[PDB]
A paper describes a structure:
B-type enzymes, of which the prototypical member is the ba3-oxidase from Thermus thermophilus (Tt), are found in both eubacteria and archaea. Toward overcoming this barrier, we applied crystallization in lipidic cubic phase (LCP), also known as in meso crystallization, and obtained highly reproducible crystals of ba3 oxidase diffracting to 1.7–1.8 Å.
The A120F mutation, which was designed with the hope of blocking one of the two entrances to the oxygen channel, is isomorphous with wild type with the Phe120 side chain occluding the entrance to the channel. Overall, 20 monoolein molecules were modeled in the asymmetric unit. The asymmetric unit of the current model of ba3-oxidase contains 225 water molecules, of which 53 are buried inside the protein.
Residue numbers in the entry:
A (entry chain A): 9 to 562
B (entry chain B): 3 to 168
C (entry chain C): 4 to 34
The structure:
């Protein structure tokens, strides 16, 4: 293919996407079984007949969380947030590095997958000590995540090469998004890298006898919060810069888009004590500080809600929609690339609402470690992020492969997207309601069928969701493979421009865009904020370490 | 048209952002209120209290569950609770209604949850550390303790009991 | 004026408030 010769970045981008979607398929297989469990129905006997290596509910849950929430999301982020800026700038990524990043992720995955599949690391995707997994789990995971440091280098390189050729020009929008995104991730990632290098790796290798569980969780959640914004922002890049064109309109504000991303750079990392409201040994004053800063990290999404809604409204009016509801009806509801992110955004309304509750310190005692939490995060990552990625396939896949989407494949995609969305909404109802009734998360409750009688009603929603999502998943597998294994190839589809939206420009503040483009400065502010939010606590913890022995309770 | 739409969009967006900020600020004030009331007793103590998980069942206040409830004030009791694979001691925990209860909870093995159904007591229990929370039971009767942190294959049936006496 | 975008942020506000005040009430009930 002469296309891959001129744009080798298409092939590497394709490899990230396909590996990501494969991980999603494998992790998601466990989903309907888990939803049935939360409906008090035990279908694990059936699962074990189909997949005999599966030893427990909790091994399945480990696979589900790792493959869906760590692997799929990272690989999608590495595809989108390298390829989009590269195409905007019309520049080639360092291809040696791009391929290195892919191989690191692939090898890392293989290495941690072995112990997971062998029942040697049934510790969940948070892997809290003293539960002690096989060394290959921690090593494989470390290599997998470090793949992203290469991606950070790649994009910083593109940006600096472009700035060298264009002195005194402001960073283009998509590239601005990606630069602040990748710099945020670098700062974010240090918690886990520190946790792995200082504690988990030496411990799992048998170099040290124990690990201090409090310091391990604190370092974990330094990364564990911003990682969710790492998952979200690739979807946001698409929603701001591509969706308005798919809708038939334009992005209504470039500056407001940049501002949202800048706030994410500053506020994504210094907030992790909101995962530790119920932990001993962390001062309540510091919990309150993180609670306040978490309420602040909500502001960029509150901003996104308006900027995006106004852009969709503008599109709908351009297409002839009148009145208060006509603009909605006039949008292109026959296009899965439009429909998927929009449905995801609708579910993000209650998803965001639950997040704000979680952040509220004392209110977290009502919901912490209950089913409410999975209800919240399925709305955010399993619906918005995942749907945006599925929809992407209807424009991104042809661009990378030259393979056309037939009218029949388009209609099947609409069905998948709607069932996936609806199943997630139904399950969210079942989980939030069960959570309010004190049903714990991370629990094979179908094996204690008389323990939660008050939850009988929401349990019905969970069974229904498990069924709906099974159907959506089966249709997705069929659909993805029908595209990936189809004969036809139209090279003009691979040579077409990406559907980037035009922007409505106004007198505005060119000064605000200039101010926001002071990236080196904003990165320093972000780093300082982390030092101020984490430093005092971590000094105390490191001076009073109490390592304890590891356990295998599976 | 496009210039006019743009102007109107930015004008109303600024109004929305001020409102949303106001709303978040009101939540912060409502949280601060909780922090000044007796309901804040369930927030774990911030001070580090280290213990050795390998000797907690042999020496010290968790070694004899029948002596776990200690009167520490005129209307105050301290209760030394062990959360372990897969249960809680003592079982039941027996306390008087209307008294301030100071729970001091640790684990000899892995992390457990300590979630008292019907109350705001919801605290992580870490081996090597003492989790200290406070609560006054206004209603007598039986309260279930649920383990809400995955602790291995016994997690889903890990429960305990608090009995509040009249 | 962007009446549609305003309708969306109205739904968002009402949802946030119902969630937050709802849980606040539960917190006090369990206190
Ligand atoms: C991608 C995934 C995730 C995002 C995003 C996310 C956002 C938030 N979360 Fe969260 N969350 C918490 C707080 C928040 C807050 C304040 C927000 C905020 O960033 C949310 C702000 C969002 C909004 C305010 C919504 C804006 C609405 C929009 C943008 C839609 C507009 C609609 C349109 C435009 C459509 C109109 C179109 C038409 C056609 C009409 C807290 C603590 O404060 C905990 C710990 C709880 C505990 O006890 O363990 C927590 C736990 C989780 C966990 C569990 C971790 C574990 O395993 O223990 C995950 C995975 C998760 C993921 C995610 N979370 N969250
Ligand atoms: C077929 C769709 C899916 C269904 C039916 C499903 C269902 C479930 C259920 C019922 C739980 C709670 C289990 C428990 O607390 O014991 C769960 C956990 C989880 N889900 Fe999903 N899910 C699906 C898709 C996804 C996807 C796409 C994501 C990520 C992109 C995701 C990420 C997670 C995470 C991170 C956990 C928590 C794991 C842990 O606590 O260790 N889910 N899901
Ligand atoms: C495990 C170790 C084997 C790793 C083998 C990795 C093979 C890399 C081949 C590859 O994709 O290299 C890029 C190629 O040079 C671009 O055309
Ligand atoms: C067996 C592992 C699967 C290996 C997947 C094949 C990777 C080959 C590859 O990297 O593509 C060729 C090269 O990169 C083009 O420039
Ligand atoms: C990737 C990195 C993975 C970690 C492996 C080696 C790093 C070097 C570890 C050095 C070993 C220090 C252990 C030590 O000296 O232990 C103190 C002892 O526990 C108190 O008496
Ligand atoms: C890189 C490839 C292999 C790293 C080899 C690491 C092999 C180290 C083995 C450590 C081990 O097996 O653990 C010791 C003990 O059981 C306490 O967990
Ligand atoms: C922009 C950044 C804003 C950061 C400023 C945040 C304000 C925190 C100050 C005091 C909180 C006091 C909370 C103390 C709670 C203790 C409750 C108690 O006594 O526990 C039982
Ligand atoms: C228990 C919870 C389960 C219920 C969950 C349901 C959530 C709301 C569903 C859809 C909202 C979508 C609103 C927009 C509808 C678009 C259809 C439309 O306007 O179509 C025009 C026509 O097709 C010409 O294209
Ligand atoms: C009690 C209430 C009932 C429980 C809900 C049952 C779940 C799914 C039903 C199937 C719904 C499938 C929806 C398909 C919609 C679709 O594909 O719509 C394209 C449209 O033209 C715009 O995009
Ligand atoms: C367009 C996007 C969609 C966004 C919209 C979806 C958000 C749903 C929000 C609230 C529903 C909750 C219903 C409130 C239920 C109240 C609970 C109740 O009545 O409980 C009585 C209790 O037993 C007394 O003790
Ligand atoms: C939109 C999707 C609507 C889904 C389900 C409808 C709700 C039906 C829930 C009815 C509860 C019936 C039940 O399970 O009964 C509880 C109890 O055990 C009896 O004594
Ligand atoms: C196109 C057709 C649309 C279909 C949409 C259906 C409408 C939603 C209502 C119920 C779902 C029923 C699924 C629940 C399966 C049985 C629930 C169960 O396990 O029963 C609990 C009962 O309380 C034990 O005592
Ligand atoms: C397109 C995908 C959406 C499809 C969604 C359709 C869901 C099925 C709805 C109704 C049939 C339910 C009738 C069967 C009810 C039997 C209940 C049952 O067997 O429950 C277990 C029982 O509690 C053991 O003790
Ligand atoms: C936490 C409580 C204490 C801390 C207080 C934090 C609250 C202040 C936040 C933002 C100020 C908003 C200032 C924004 C003004 C910039 C003007 C602008 O950009 O608009 C000009 C427009 O484009 C042409 O008319
Ligand atoms: C580590 C270095 C990367 C982090 C610093 C990024 C900001 C920066 O280097 O800003 C100037 C730019 O290189 C001029 O175009
Ligand atoms: C339980 C009851 C709950 C109800 C709670 C109320 C919800 C308020 C919602 C949105 C406010 C949006 C901000 C409104 C915009 C401000 C006006 C503005 O900026 O418009 C001036 C413009 O320049 C003229 O051309
Ligand atoms: C320009 C307009 C400015 C006016 C806007 C003002 C915001 C009003 C909202 C909340 C006030 C907070 C009320 C604090 C009282 C809390 C009492 C409470 O909730 O009591 C709980 C329980 O019953 C006993 O502990
Ligand atoms: C759509 C979602 C709708 C969801 C509907 C909302 C469900 C919340 C219900 C109750 C929470 C309040 C708990 C109040 C605690 C009292 C329990 C109690 O008294 O039990 C303890 C003890 O055992 C007695 O002696
Ligand atoms: C459509 C998909 C989105 C999923 C939607 C999730 C549903 C949760 C909604 C609202 C939570 C509000 C809290 C409900 C509690 C209200 C009970 C109340 O009013 O509390 C007083 C009572 O005395 C206490 O014991
Ligand atoms: C809005 C003003 C804040 C008042 C909160 C109203 C509420 O939900 O009451 C709190 C609690 O239930 C009192 O017993
Ligand atoms: Cu102890 Cu779960
Ligand atoms: O993590 O929200
Ligand atoms: Cu977080």
């Amino acid at each position: 293919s002469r296309v891959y010769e001129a744009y080798p970045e298409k092939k590497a981008t394709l490899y990230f996407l396909v590996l990501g979607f494969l991980a999603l398929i494998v992790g998601s297989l466990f989903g309907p079984f888990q939803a049935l469990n939360y409906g008090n129905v035990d279908a694990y006997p059936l699962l074990k007949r189909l997949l005999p290596f599966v030893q427990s509910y909790y091994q399945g849950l480990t696979l589900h969380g790792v493959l869906n929430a760590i692997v799929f999301t990272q690989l999608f982020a590495q595809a989108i947030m390298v390829y989009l800026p590269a195409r905007e700038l019309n520049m080639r990524p360092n291809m040696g590095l791009m391929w290195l990043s892919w191989w690191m992720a692939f090898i890392g995955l293989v290495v941690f997958a072995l112990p997971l599949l062998a029942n040697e690391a049934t510790v969940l995707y948070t892997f809290y000590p003293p539960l002690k997994g096989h060394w290959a789990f921690y090593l494989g995971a470390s290599v997998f995540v470090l793949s992203t440091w290469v991606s950070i280098y790649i994009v910083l390189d593109l940006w600096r090469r472009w700035k060298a050729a264009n002195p005194g020009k402001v960073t283009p929008l998509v590239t601005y998004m990606a630069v602040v995104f990748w710099l945020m991730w670098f700062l974010a990632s240090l918690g886990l890298v520190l946790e792995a290098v200082l504690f988990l790796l030496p411990w799992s290798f048998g170099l040290v006898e124990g690990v201090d569980p409090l310091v391990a969780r604190t370092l974990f959640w330094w990364t564990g919060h911003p990682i969710v914004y790492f998952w979200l922002l690739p979807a946001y890049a698409i929603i701001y810069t591509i969706l308005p064109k798919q809708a038939g309109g334009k992005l209504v504000s470039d500056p407001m888009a940049r501002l949202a991303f800048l706030l994410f750079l500053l506020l994504s990392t210094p907030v992790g004590f909101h995962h530790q409201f119920a932990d001993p040994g962390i001062d309540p004053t510091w919990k309150m500080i993180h609670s306040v800063l978490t309420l602040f990290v909500a502001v960029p999404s509150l901003m996104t809600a308006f900027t995006v809604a106004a852009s969709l409204e503008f599109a709908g009016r351009l297409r002839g929609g009148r009145g208060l509801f006509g603009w909605i009806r006039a949008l292109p509801w026959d296009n899965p690339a439009f429909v998927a992110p929009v449905l995801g955004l609708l579910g993000f309304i209650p998803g965001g609402a639950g997040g704000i509750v979680n952040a509220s310190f004392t209110l977290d005692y009502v919901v912490h470690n209950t089913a409410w939490v999975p209800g919240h995060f399925h709305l955010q990552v399993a619906s918005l992020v995942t749907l945006t990625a599925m929809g992407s396939l209807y424009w991104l896949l042809p661009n990378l492969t030259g393979k056309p989407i037939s009218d029949a494949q388009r209609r099947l995609g609409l069905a998948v997207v709607w069932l996936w969305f609806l199943g997630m909404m139904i399950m969210a109802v079942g989980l939030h309601w069960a959570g309010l009734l004190n049903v714990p998360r991370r629990a094979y409750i179908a094996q204690v069928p008389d323990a939660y009688p008050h939850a009988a009603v929401p349990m019905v929603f969970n069974v229904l969701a498990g069924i709906v999502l099974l159907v959506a998943l089966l249709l997705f597998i069929y659909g993805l493979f029908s595209v990936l294994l189809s004969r036809e190839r139209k090279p003009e589809l691979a040579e077409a421009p990406l559907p980037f939206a035009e922007v409505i420009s106004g007198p505005e503040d060119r000064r605000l865009v200039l101010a926001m483009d002071r990236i080196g400065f904003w990165f320093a502010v972000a780093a300082i904020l982390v030092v101020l939010a984490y430093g005092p606590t971590l000094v105390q913890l490191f001076g009073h370490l109490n390592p304890v022995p590891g356990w295998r309770l599976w | 048209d496009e210039h006019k739409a743009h102007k109107a969009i930015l004008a109303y967006e600024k109004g929305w952002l001020a409102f949303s900020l106001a709303m978040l600020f009101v939540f912060i004030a409502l949280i601060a209120y909780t922090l000044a009331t007796h309901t804040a007793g369930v927030i774990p103590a911030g001070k580090l209290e280290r213990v050795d998980p390998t000797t907690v069942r042999q020496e010290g206040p968790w070694a004899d569950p029948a002596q776990a409830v200690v009167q520490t004030g005129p209307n105050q009791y301290t209760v030394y609770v062990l959360a372990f694979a897969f249960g809680y001691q003592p079982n039941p925990i027996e306390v008087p209604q209307g008294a301030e209860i100071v729970f001091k909870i640790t684990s000899p093995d892995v992390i457990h949850g300590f979630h008292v159904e019907g109350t705001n007591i919801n605290v992580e229990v870490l081996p090597g550390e003492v989790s200290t929370v406070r609560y006054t039971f206004k209603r007598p009767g039986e309260y279930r303790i649920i383990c809400n942190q995955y602790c291995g294959l016994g997690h889903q049936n890990m429960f305990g009991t608090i009995v509040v006496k009249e | 004026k962007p009446k549609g975008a305003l309708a969306v942020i109205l739904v968002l506000t009402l949802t946030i408030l119902v969630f937050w005040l709802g849980v606040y009430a539960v917190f006090f009930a369990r206190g």
